[PDB]
């Protein structure tokens, strides 16, 4: 606890514009209920993972 | 109007608010390549700044205190 | 890699539809044969053919 | 290095004002610090202090 | 024309120009 550092919630800075964003395998189980239906699937296995 | 008289004869933007954001965006990431910082141009600008108000926070104290005729 | 998505970002051009297409059409799939089988072992694989 | 270079006639970004401004910042710290010392060269350091 | 009497029912730049250069 250091009282000239109280820990808070915020937001940073932006980029120049190209960007989906993925994910990885850990924590795919309890984490899964925020966005709703907004993919661009393709369920085609010409991907691979 | 000389030439003429010499003669006598007498007389929308998002099409590039988006065009620009790419050119925007290809700059950033094609930064990230050559790990080319385009901030350093601005922290040191910025510490060099308020290394100057707190310079300055000095030099204004003495004429506050010694009198611009003094430090004159 | 990077200068791909971000020039994904002007086109609006999705490109994971091409798979949540494919995981939603996978689902219910699974969920789909779920039923067929289920027939199978309460039917009997000799009824149902 | 090139595409930046020539991406950046587009914006109109001025890659250098990030230093233009530090360099005339600096000079001016530099001759401020050159008052500053002057008169601890000629008030003492235990004057000024 | 045939198909409508078949029937009978008659009937700005520099956003470009330096869109060009940086190309």
């Given at each position: 606890y250091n009282p000239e550092k109280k820990e808070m919630i915020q937001e940073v800075i932006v980029e120049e514009d190209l960007e989906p964003f993925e994910a990885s395998k850990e924590t795919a189980e309890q984490f899964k209920?925020?966005?709703?239906?907004?993919v661009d699937i393709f369920e085609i296995p010409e991907t691979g993972e | 109007q000389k030439y003429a008289s010499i003669v006598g004869v007498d007389l929308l933007e998002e099409i590039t608010k988006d065009h620009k954001v790419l050119a925007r965006q290809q700059l950033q990431v094609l930064a990230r390549y050559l790990k080319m910082d385009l901030d350093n141009g601005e922290r040191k600008f910025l510490k060099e700044k308020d290394t100057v108000a707190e310079l300055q926070a000095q030099l204004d104290y003495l004429n506050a205190e010694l009198g611009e005729f003094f430090v004159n």
């Amino acid at each position: 606890y250091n009282p000239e550092k109280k820990e808070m919630i915020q937001e940073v800075i932006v980029e120049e514009d190209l960007e989906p964003f993925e994910a990885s395998k850990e924590t795919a189980e309890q984490f899964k209920h925020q966005h709703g239906d907004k993919v661009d699937i393709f369920e085609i296995p010409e991907t691979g993972e | 109007q000389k030439y003429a008289s010499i003669v006598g004869v007498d007389l929308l933007e998002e099409i590039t608010k988006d065009h620009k954001v790419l050119a925007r965006q290809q700059l950033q990431v094609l930064a990230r390549y050559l790990k080319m910082d385009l901030d350093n141009g601005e922290r040191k600008f910025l510490k060099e700044k308020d290394t100057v108000a707190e310079l300055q926070a000095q030099l204004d104290y003495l004429n506050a205190e010694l009198g611009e005729f003094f430090v004159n």
